[PDB]
Structure formats: C-alpha cells, structure tokens
Amino acid sequence: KSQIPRLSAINDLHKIWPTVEEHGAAIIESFLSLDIVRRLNEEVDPFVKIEPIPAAKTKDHPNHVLSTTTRLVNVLAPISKAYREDVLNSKVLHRICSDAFHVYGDYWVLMGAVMELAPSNPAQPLHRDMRFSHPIVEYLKPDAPATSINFLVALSPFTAENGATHVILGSHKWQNLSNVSMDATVRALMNPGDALLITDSTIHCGGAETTGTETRRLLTITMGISQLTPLESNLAVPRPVIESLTPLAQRLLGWASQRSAAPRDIGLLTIRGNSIEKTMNLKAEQPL
Amino acid sequence: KSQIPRLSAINDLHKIWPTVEEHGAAIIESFLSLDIVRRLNEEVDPFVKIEPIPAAKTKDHPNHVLSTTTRLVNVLAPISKAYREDVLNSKVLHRICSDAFHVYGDYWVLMGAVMELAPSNPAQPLHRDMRFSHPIVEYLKPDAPATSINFLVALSPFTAENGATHVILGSHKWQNLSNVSMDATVRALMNPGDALLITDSTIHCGGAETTGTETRRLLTITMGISQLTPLESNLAVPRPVIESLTPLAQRLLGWASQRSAAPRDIGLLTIRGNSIEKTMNLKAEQPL
Numbered sequence: 001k002s003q004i005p006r007l008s009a010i011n012d013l014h015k016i017w018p019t020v021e022e023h024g025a026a027i028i029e030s031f032l033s034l035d036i037v038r039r040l041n042e043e044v045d046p047f048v049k050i051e052p053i054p055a056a057k058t059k060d061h062p063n064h065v066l067s068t069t070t071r072l073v074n075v076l077a078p079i080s081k082a083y084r085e086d087v088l089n090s091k092v093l094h095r096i097c098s099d100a101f102h103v104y105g106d107y108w109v110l111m112g113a114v115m116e117l118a119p120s121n122p123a124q125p126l127h128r129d130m131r132f133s134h135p136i137v138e139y140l141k142p143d144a145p146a147t148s149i150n151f152l153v154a155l156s157p158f159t160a161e162n163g164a165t166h167v168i169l170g171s172h173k174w175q176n177l178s179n180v181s182m183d184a185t186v187r188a189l190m191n192p193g194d195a196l197l198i199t200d201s202t203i204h205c206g207g208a209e210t211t212g213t214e215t216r217r218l219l220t221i222t223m224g225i226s227q228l229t230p231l232e233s234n235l236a237v238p239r240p241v242i243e244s245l246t247p248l249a250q251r252l253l254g255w256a257s258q259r260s261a262a263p264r265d266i267g268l269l270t271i272r273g274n275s276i277e278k279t280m281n282l283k284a285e286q287p288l
Numbered sequence: 289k290s291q292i293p294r295l296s297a298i299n300d301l302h303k304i305w306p307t308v309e310e311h312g313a314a315i316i317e318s319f320l321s322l323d324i325v326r327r328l329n330e331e332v333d334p335f336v337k338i339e340p341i342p343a344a345k346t347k348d349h350p351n352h353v354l355s356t357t358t359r360l361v362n363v364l365a366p367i368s369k370a371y372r373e374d375v376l377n378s379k380v381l382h383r384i385c386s387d388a389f390h391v392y393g394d395y396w397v398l399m400g401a402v403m404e405l406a407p408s409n410p411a412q413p414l415h416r417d418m419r420f421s422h423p424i425v426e427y428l429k430p431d432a433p434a435t436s437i438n439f440l441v442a443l444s445p446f447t448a449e450n451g452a453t454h455v456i457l458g459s460h461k462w463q464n465l466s467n468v469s470m471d472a473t474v475r476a477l478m479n480p481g482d483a484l485l486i487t488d489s490t491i492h493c494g495g496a497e498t499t500g501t502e503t504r505r506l507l508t509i510t511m512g513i514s515q516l517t518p519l520e521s522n523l524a525v526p527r528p529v530i531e532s533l534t535p536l537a538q539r540l541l542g543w544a545s546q547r548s549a550a551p552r553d554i555g556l557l558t559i560r561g562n563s564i565e566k567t568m569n570l571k572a573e574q575p576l
C-alpha cells in the first residue's frame with residue numbers, strides 16, 4: 001500500500017495543502033530547521049519535566065483520555081521564544097493555513113503543545129481529533145472544508161519501533177467507520193523538524209513505544225478557523241510578552257479581533273465596531 | 289395563519305425551549321421586569337446617543353449590513369449594572385440555554401447588544417443570523433441542534449406600525465428557501481420586557497418604522513455554545529468590573545474556561561490542565 005506523501009517545505013509549498021486535502025496526510029520535510037527544534041527543546045525542557053499526569057487530581061480540567069505516560073504542556077508563548085517568534089510566524093505554516101481555511105476566513109491556534117511520551121508508552125486507539133472538546137464538528141456536512149488541521153512536528157526521531165504516528169490515508173473522507181483497523185495504517189517516519197500534517201477528519205493514532213528506552217517528543221499545532229474556540233487560553237500571558245509579538249502572532253493567540261470570509265464580514269471579538277488591538281492600544285514587536 | 293406562541297416566564301418555563309424548537313419562535317412575556325428594563329435603559333442611554341453609524345469610517349470593524357438609522361452598542365457589562373447582574377444571571381435565560389445547548393455543553397454570550405432604530409428605519413430583508421460572522425454554521429447538517437439562539441428583548445413597545453420584528457414560523461426547519469416571502473411572516477407584538485426568542489435558523493427581519501415619530505429599542509442577546517467564538521470581546525473590561533460578577537456571568541463573558549458535553553471532556557480555554565479563573569486567581573462577587 002501507498003506511503004504518506006513527502007513534501008519539501010522549501011520547494012513544494014503550494015502542493016502541501018492540496019496533497020493533504022486529497023490524501024488526508026502529508027509529511028513536510030524540514031518544516032522547522034534543526035536550530036529552531038534545538039531552541040524549542042531547550043526552552044520547553046523544564047516545563048515538560050515538571051508536568052504531572054494528564055489527569056492529575058490537582059487539575060481543574062483533567063485530561064482523562066491521554067495515557068499516564070504522556071506529558072503535554074500547552075500555552076507555549078510565555079515559555080518559548082522560538083515558539084512565539086519563529087513557529088508562530090512560520091511562512092510555511094501560514095501559506096498552508098490560508099490555503100486550507102480561505103472558505104471560512106481568519107484562523108488561529110486552537111492548541112500549541114509539546115507532547116512527550118515516556119518509554120513503553122502504549123499505542124493510542126485510532127481516532128479523529130476534536131471529539132473531546134468540539135462536539136459541534138461531528139455535526140458538519142461531509143463536504144464541509146476542514147475547520148481545523150494538526151501539525152505534528154517531530155522534536156525527536158519518529159521510528160516504527162519507538163511509536164511513530166499511524167494514519168489511514170483517505171480516511172478524512174470516510175463516512176462509514178467499519179474499515180477502521182491498524183491493518184489500514186501507514187507510519188509517519190520522521191526526523192526532528194519534519195512535520196506530519198493531518199486534518200480533523202484524518203483517522204490516526206500515536207504508536208506503541210516498544211524499546212523501553214526511547215523518549216519521543218512532538219510539537220502538536222492544531223490550527224483552526226477563528227470561529228471555533230481554542231482548547232487553550234493565552235489570557236494570562238503577560239502583556240510584555242504579548243507586546244513583543246508580531247501582530248500576526250498576537251491574532252493567533254486571541255489577542256486580536258478576527259474576521260470571517262463573508263463578503264460583508266462583521267467580525268469576531270470586536271468592541272462596538274473596533275478591534276481589541278485598537279481599543280486596548282496594544283503594541284507589537286516591542287523587544288523584551 | 290398561526291401567531292407566535294406566547295409563554296409565561298413565571299409559569300411556562302419548561303415549555304419555552306420545546307416551543308421554540310418546534311415552531312422556531314416564541315414570545316416570553318415579562319422576560320425582564322419593568323424595573324430591570326428601566327435601569328437597563330437609563331444605563332445604556334448615553335452610549336446609544338454617542339454611537340455613530342454602523343459603518344462609520346472611524347471603525348476598525350465596520351458593520352456594512354445594518355441600516356444607517358441603526359445604533360447598536362455591544363460589550364454592555366462595563367456600561368450596565370442591570371445587564372451584568374440581573375440579565376446575565378437570569379434564571380429564565382439559563383434554563384432555556386441549558387435546555388437548548390445540552391447536547392453540545394457550555395454556552396456563553398456571543399453578543400449582548402442594545403439596538404435602537406431611528407424613526408423611519410426601513411424593514412430589513414428576511415434573513416438568518418450568523419451568516420456575516422460564522423460561515424461555519426451554514427455547513428452544519430439540517431438535524432444539528434441549534435448552536436446559537438437570540439433573545440430579542442423589547443426595551444420599548446413593538447407595534448405593527450413602528451417596526452415590530454417579523455418571523456416565519458417553522459422556517460428554522462426549512463432547507464429550500466424559495467417560499468421566503470413577507471407574505472409568510474407574523475409579527476412579534478411586544479410590551480417592554482417581553483422577549484422574542486428565535487434560533488440561528490429562524491428566518492426573520494426587523495420591521496418598517498412607518499410613523500416617522502417612534503424610536504424602537506431592543507436588547508438582543510445571542511447565546512451560543514462555548515465552542516463558537518463570540519462576535520464581541522470582553523478582554524478590555526476592567527478587572528474590578530469582572531470580579532464584581534458571579535462566576536456564571538464571568539463564564540458567559542469569556543472570563544472563565546469552558547466545557548463541552550463529551551463524556552471525557554478535555555475543555556476549552558484551559559491552561560495546562562487548569563482553568564483561567566484558577567490560574568489568574570480571579571475573584572467573584574466583589575462589590576464595587
């Protein structure tokens with residue numbers, strides 16, 4: 001059977017979204033440079049080491065779904081200069097997202113998280129994303145363009161034996177889910193900096209860590225239309241951090257008003273006809 | 289033909305949502321007391337007098353749809369004690385919204401606005417709400433439960449001659465929109481404090497002001513599932529105002545995390561497994 005299409009972030013930029021739209025998945029080789037991966041890893045390191053189990057009893061909003069051997073840390077902007085500067089302003093990411101979401105309008109970050117899987121982390125069941133947070137998405141017509149997409153960026157090697165993600169190609173177009181089987185999957189074998197791009201309808205799962213020694217880490221960036229509420233909030237991010245960002249990054253984090261693609265769009269998160277950023281006199285690109 | 293069903297806010301509470309679900313519209317008599325209407329009117333008065341045309345050239349997010357004789361002012365919490373206290377904690381509103389949105393989960397305010405129509409304001413074309421802000425809603429399956437509803441609360445008399453709202457009963461279930469005609473409408477004749485309740489699929493329009501003397505005013509409260517982004521932002525509302533609110537009102541204004549109805553819900557606007565309100569040590573019901 002056919003493998004996940006592989007594309008250049010440098011040369012094949014216009015081909016990436018059409019490839020995902022057709023096949024449900026694509027690998028973007030060198031989506032992030034090794035320099036960015038390195039800085040990103042350094043910056044998030046301590047925060048993933050301190051992270052408790054997904055369903056820690058201390059938590060207000062425990063995640064009862066992820067395995068106990070998963071450490072997920074979101075709201076990365078205050079943690080990581082590399083994230084808030086380099087990845088939030090990624091030319092490749094923005095071309096793909098504008099290609100993907102043009103029918104709907106503005107898009108933003110639903111969740112940017114670093115996920116680290118401990119050695120011996122088990123395979124997840126095959127699933128579609130968004131079903132534990134956005135029940136609305138299940139009620140969309142089958143030809144509705146994808147309302148969110150997920151960049152699964154390797155921050156360490158993804159191998160068959162260490163739990164590289166499985167996808168079922170074409171499954172983003174499936175309505176009958178009885179052919180759902182691990183027999184139908186292929187793997188996203190990836191180097192650090194490569195990214196697996198899927199839609200919210202692509203059937204996929206984390207793989208089984210079978211070595212007992214390897215710790216796999218990824219940066220998962222769920223980008224979605226600005227009409228859907230983010231899984232994560234940047235409301236508590238300090239204003240000096242927000243004001244150091246580009247206007248585009250501020251929009252991505254919910255620190256700007258948003259626009260739909262309707263011809264006479266009336267906007268989202270507006271304040272009596274004016275934007276958040278105008279109203280609050282929000283500055284941009286102020287060095288820290 | 290049949291008129292809009294009329295219901296008591298006091299006695300018929302459990303019947304209101306079932307009535308709207310069936311007919312697409314209902315009138316809730318005395319939804320707000322005359323005392324609340326009075327205080328609300330006093331408090332918003334100056335702000336509607338200062339409001340420029342919907343598409344004022346000074347505006348970041350001009351509304352090119354509403355007539356030039358419309359004054360709409362949203363983000364009412366900092367303007368009105370009556371709004372932020374009495375209407376945001378309305379027992380009737382919350383019973384209806386929990387009835388309406390239980391399949392999806394938490395709901396919040398998409399927009400709370402005072403609309404005032406000048407004398408001679410023309411009839412709006414027949415329409416469904418949400419199409420200039422949430423293109424996603426058009427892609428929902430026809431049996432998808434309503435994802436937003438709109439309380440059109442009379443703040444002055446609604447009469448046939450002064451432009452009382454038109455609705456087409458049953459039109460929330462229409463898929464073919466070729467029977468759309470003013471011939472198919474009935475009017476929401478209402479006293480101050482009464483409310484017309486419609487869904488996002490109910491076909492309706494503002495009426496023609498034919499007297500040349502009467503100024504009609506309403507409070508429009510679009511309540512929607514917390515998975516959809518509000519038309520308006522409360523990000524710039526001062527913290528002392530927010531901290532004077534009940535926890536429920538804070539949630540309604542986007543100053544709290546939110547939950548979906550998925551069995552193992554992972555939540556919306558969360559911060560690494562904890563809520564906004566826990567993270568920011570947000571107080572509630574602190575008198576000003």
Ligand SMILES: COc1ccc(C[C@H]2C(=O)Nc3ccccc3C(=O)N2C)cc1
Pocket residue numbers: 063065066067113115124125127128129130131132220222554
């Ligand atoms: C163990 O079995 C699972 C079943 C389903 C899921 C889906 C997933 C989701 O819908 N969104 C994301 C996206 C990025 C990172 C994590 C998640 C996340 O928490 N869940 C639950 C995860 C695990």
Ligand SMILES: COc1ccc(C[C@H]2C(=O)Nc3ccccc3C(=O)N2C)cc1
Pocket residue numbers: 266351353354355401403412413415416417418419420508510
């Ligand atoms: C003049 O013709 C019109 C055509 C359509 C509309 C729809 C409406 C909407 O979708 N949502 C609301 C809801 C509450 C108050 C105002 C509005 C608002 O601005 N529009 C555009 C209004 C006017």
Ligand SMILES: O=C(O)CCC(=O)C(=O)O
Pocket residue numbers: 124129152163164165204205206207218
């Ligand atoms: O671990 C992976 O590679 C996939 C994780 C995933 O799909 C999820 O948690 O939603």
Ligand SMILES: O=C(O)CCC(=O)C(=O)O
Pocket residue numbers: 412417440451452453492493494495506
């Ligand atoms: O003026 C009215 O009564 C209805 C207004 C309305 O439906 C709208 O502006 O969306």
Ligand code: NI
Pocket residue numbers: 127128129204205
């Ligand atoms: Ni997943």
Ligand code: NI
Pocket residue numbers: 415416417492493
């Ligand atoms: Ni309307």
